[PDB]
Design an enzyme around this catalytic site. Structure first.
Site, PDB file in Angstrom:
ATOM      1  N   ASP A 167       0.855  -1.180   0.000  1.00  0.00           N
ATOM      2  CA  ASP A 167       0.000   0.000   0.000  1.00  0.00           C
ATOM      3  C   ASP A 167       0.893   1.233   0.000  1.00  0.00           C
ATOM      4  N   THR A 174      77.920   2.310  -6.938  1.00  0.00           N
ATOM      5  CA  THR A 174      77.561   0.944  -7.287  1.00  0.00           C
ATOM      6  C   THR A 174      77.835   0.001  -6.117  1.00  0.00           C
ATOM      7  OG1 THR A 174      79.738   0.602  -8.290  1.00  0.00           O
ATOM      8  CG2 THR A 174      77.947   1.328  -9.728  1.00  0.00           C
ATOM      9  N   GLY A 223      73.368  -1.894  -3.777  1.00  0.00           N
ATOM     10  CA  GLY A 223      72.181  -2.729  -3.789  1.00  0.00           C
ATOM     11  C   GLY A 223      70.870  -1.976  -3.758  1.00  0.00           C
ATOM     12  N   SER A 240      68.996  -2.003  -6.242  1.00  0.00           N
ATOM     13  CA  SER A 240      68.126  -2.954  -6.921  1.00  0.00           C
ATOM     14  C   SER A 240      67.429  -3.877  -5.933  1.00  0.00           C
ATOM     15  CB  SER A 240      68.929  -3.768  -7.933  1.00  0.00           C
ATOM     16  OG  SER A 240      69.457  -2.935  -8.950  1.00  0.00           O
TER      17      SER A 240
END
Ligand SMILES: [Zn+2]
Lengths: 751, 87
Positions: A151, A474, A477, A479
């Site tokens: 409703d 160098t 590390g 990397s």
């Protein structure tokens, strides 16, 4: 508001409390009280309520399944309406609605009526007024007899609802009985606002259906068997004549061979209800619609679950298997349409098995998606393949909860709590590796802190205004740090070449220009040292353009050029960067991270013992790089990153440049600290010192300036820099030479 | 480039006792370290390997990894293997 504990009632008036109302109801069982709002403007915040009335009797199983589907449909529709209009959150509204609700009943066994109230969801009465058309469409676009019977009235100003346990009329003895688990009179009041922790709030025969003959044919097809009293039904006898059927085959609706009495068809809410007479449970209720597609209602139900939104650029992001996928090559909407059919009623599932219908109900979805949304807006969350990890709190969310955040990217690997630990030997090995890379001495203190900060910014979806430089000899590390970061941050991290450091940033189609979209970190390695003649200087234009919060770039065969920039840019090399163009913005947009660790084997250790490349030297090990490649310390390193981000990210964290470690900028710093722009009322001191002022501009000869600056700075070191600076600040004219204007700070201080 | 480091040695920073001895052979011993002249370093490099096939590479390597005991002077910090090794 903080809720309301006063209930205003009308006797056909009073203002009673919970205990007062309970006592009054206990004293007078036959009193008819209607709960309403004492003041519409003051306390317009009310609960969410609905009233349902279906004049038929249903068994336990049918009622249970129907009420489950009714809850699903209503909750999804209301949450969609809140999301589109009121600006709420779909998942929150769904959770609040389905968590707890109060459901009454009717003592009458010949009909099914109740008033349902959602406990934890609260909204203003104006919102419930506005929900009128949407709820009416939902009522008229469904098959569930409970949903069809909603409703839509009672959504008016100063409305009233019949209280539980009180007779609606003195003549009618039927009353609504409460049901478990509420059992309290305050759990069935639509004004009893009780805002708490687990809650949410939001705010801002008609001929027009179908031809009679087709409706009669549909009814006959539903009955399967032919009608004995056929050719007798018409417009006038629509709800009067009984439908007598020959029991050639058992009834489709009831499966029984026969029944005491025939069926009857009635009209309600633009639909036909078919029901038996006498014993009500002998046959079920059959519903026949009278308007609308069947493929449009399915599209609406799939759409209002908030699972097929479109992005602000024009891509439809779908939610399949607990992740916001999207593709512009093989669009995924049909996969979603197929995979969602389980959360739909029985009659809506058989349709989504013909591929020609999952394109109709897909064109409808595409036509109903007008306006866009925003994706990946919260930058303190890390999207993992099976959820979202929260960074500020550390709690992980999996499943539909991660839906709350439109995370269009992911790290690529699942999240495991067992490996996500604190005291593990892998954690200690990673700590030792980091200490080897970054010694924790007091001399390194500041550099180490900058290292940790610039490394922990990878867990941030915001934009950063600095470009840290990894400067180290160098065998340091770096990397290893790159590998650990990649393993920790997943595929969000990206490694790019120096192609952007020399050429134009935008220019033509650059893959890295488009790849910077939503990637959280960009790393460049082995920079093309400009110290030797021939190599291009670091493009100042590219560095300046990479700092903005937006990325402009279009690749081949494309038109989109706007990308959100979140990547932190890191450059690693053993050579000092050289930029041809220099300005104060560049001097305020460069940071340097120093490496003072040497990892060398014993064979050259003595050679590294006296080496001046690093402040310390230690034995290396070839058995570590593969370990990092094997995602060994991934989750411990992630925990470290989270801790660093927590300790670093104040309410506002900023990347502060460090313009002291760059040797190239040191010349500009020295020039500025020893010479700046030239102060009118200081002529006597200048005359005493030897300098002269002419035309309200103190000037000295170019040869005189060169002689004065010859001793202050090494001419052979940066003669080109000095010449370029003179050209930039050239004035020319005046006297018999050019004009140079500056103040010798060292001589200015000395009187 | 590969063979440049074969006949080259790192700067003997910790050779303070031997820096004075090496200075008398043609070094300046500035900043408590032995430093040879840039012209002297170029002559030594040209003597070490055939200068016909070795041109700008030596100068580029020196500019990359050598210093003149200051911001820029006529010296070189490149330590010769045959000289820095000997105290
Ligand atoms: Zn039947």
């Amino acid at each position: 508001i903080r809720g309301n504990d006063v209930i205003f009632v009308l006797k056909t008036v009073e203002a009673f409390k919970c205990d007062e109302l309970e006592r009054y109801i206990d004293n007078n069982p036959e009193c008819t009280l209607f709960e309403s709002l004492r003041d519409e403007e003051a306390y317009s915040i009310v609960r969410i309520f609905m009233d349902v009335d279906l004049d038929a009797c249903l068994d336990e199983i049918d009622y249970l399944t129907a009420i489950q589907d009714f809850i699903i449909e209503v909750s999804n529709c209301v949450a969609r309406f809140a999301f589109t209009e009121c600006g709420a959150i779909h998942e929150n509204v769904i959770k609040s609605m389905r968590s707890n609700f109060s459901l009454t009943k009717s003592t009458n066994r010949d009909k099914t009526s109740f008033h349902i109230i959602f406990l934890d969801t609260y909204t203003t009465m104006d919102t419930l007024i506005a929900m009128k058309r949407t709820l009416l469409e939902l009522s008229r676009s469904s098959e569930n007899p409970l949903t069809r019977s909603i409703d839509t009235a009672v959504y008016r100003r100063k409305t009233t609802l019949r209280v539980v346990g009180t007779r609606k009329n003195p003549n009618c003895d039927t009353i609504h009985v409460m049901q478990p688990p509420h059992d309290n009179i305050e759990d069935y009041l639509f004004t009893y606002v009780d805002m708490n922790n687990n809650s949410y709030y939001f705010s801002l025969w008609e001929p027009g259906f179908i031809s009679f003959e087709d409706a009669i044919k549909r009814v006959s097809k539903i009955f399967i068997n032919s009608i004995i009293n056929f050719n007798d039904l018409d417009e006038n006898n629509f709800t009067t004549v009984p439908l007598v059927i020959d029991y050639v085959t058992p009834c489709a609706l009831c499966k029984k061979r026969s029944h005491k009495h025939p069926h009857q068809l009635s009209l309600e809410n633009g639909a036909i209800r078919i029901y038996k007479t006498g014993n009500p449970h002998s046959c079920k209720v059959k519903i026949v619609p009278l308007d609308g597609n069947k493929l449009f209602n399915i599209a609406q139900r799939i759409l209002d679950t908030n699972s097929v939104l479109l992005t602000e650029r024009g891509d439809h992001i779908v939610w399949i298997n607990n992740s916001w996928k999207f593709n512009s090559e093989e669009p995924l909407i049909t996969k979603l349409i197929l995979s969602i059919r389980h959360q739909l009623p029985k009659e809506y599932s058989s349709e989504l098995l013909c591929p020609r219908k999952r394109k109709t109900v897909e064109a409808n979805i595409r036509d109903m998606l007008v306006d866009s949304v925003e994706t990946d807006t919260y930058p303190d969350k890390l999207p993992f393949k099976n959820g979202v990890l929260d960074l500020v709190d550390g709690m992980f969310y999996s499943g539909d909860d991660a839906k709350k955040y439109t995370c269009t990217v992911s790290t690529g690997f699942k999240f495991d709590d067992t490996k996500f630990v604190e005291d593990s030997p892998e954690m200690e090995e990673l700590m030792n590796i980091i200490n080897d890379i970054q010694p924790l001495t007091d001399e390194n203190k500041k550099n180490r802190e900058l290292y940790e900060k610039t490394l922990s910014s990878c867990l941030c979806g915001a934009t950063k205004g600095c470009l840290t430089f990894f400067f180290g000899e160098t065998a340091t590390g770096k990397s290893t740090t790159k590998r650990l970061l990649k393993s920790a941050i997943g595929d969000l991290f990206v490694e790019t070449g120096q192609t952007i450091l020399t050429d134009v940033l935008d220019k033509g189609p650059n893959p890295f220009i488009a790849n910077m979209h939503l990637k959280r970190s960009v790393f460049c390695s082995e920079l093309p040292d400009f110290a030797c003649s021939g190599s291009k200087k670091i493009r100042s234009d590219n560095i300046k353009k990479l700092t903005e919060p937006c990325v402009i770039g279009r690749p081949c065969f494309s038109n989109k050029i706007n990308n959100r920039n979140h990547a932190t840019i890191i450059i690693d090399t053993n050579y000092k960067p050289v930029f041809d163009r220099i300005d104060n913005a560049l001097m305020r947009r460069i940071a340097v991270v120093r490496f003072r660790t040497h990892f060398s084997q014993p064979s050259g250790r003595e050679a590294a013992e006296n080496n001046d490349a690093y402040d310390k030297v230690k034995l290396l090990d070839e058995g570590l790089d593969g370990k990092i490649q094997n995602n060994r310390y991934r989750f411990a390193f992630l925990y470290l990153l989270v801790k660093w981000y927590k300790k670093y990210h104040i309410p506002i964290m900023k990347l502060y440049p460090t313009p002291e470690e760059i040797p190239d900028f040191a010349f500009y710093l020295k020039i500025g600290t020893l010479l700046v722009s030239s102060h009118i009322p200081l002529m006597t001191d200048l005359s005493k010192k030897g300098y002269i002022l002419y035309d309200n501009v103190v000037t000295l000869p170019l040869t005189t300036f060169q002689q004065k600056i010859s001793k202050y700075f090494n001419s052979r070191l940066f003669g080109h820099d000095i010449e370029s600076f003179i050209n930039r600040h050239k004035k020319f004219a005046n006297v018999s030479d050019e004009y140079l204007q500056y103040i010798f700070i060292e001589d200015i201080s000395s009187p | 480039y590969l063979k440049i480091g074969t006949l080259l040695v790192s700067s003997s920073v910790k050779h303070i006792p031997l820096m004075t001895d090496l200075s008398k052979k043609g070094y300046i011993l500035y900043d408590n370290v032995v430093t040879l002249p840039l012209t002297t370093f170029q002559q030594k490099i040209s003597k070490y390997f055939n200068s016909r096939l070795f041109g700008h590479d030596i100068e580029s390597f020196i500019n990359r990894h050598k210093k003149f005991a200051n911001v820029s002077d006529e010296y070189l910090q490149y330590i010769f293997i045959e000289d820095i090794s000997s105290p």
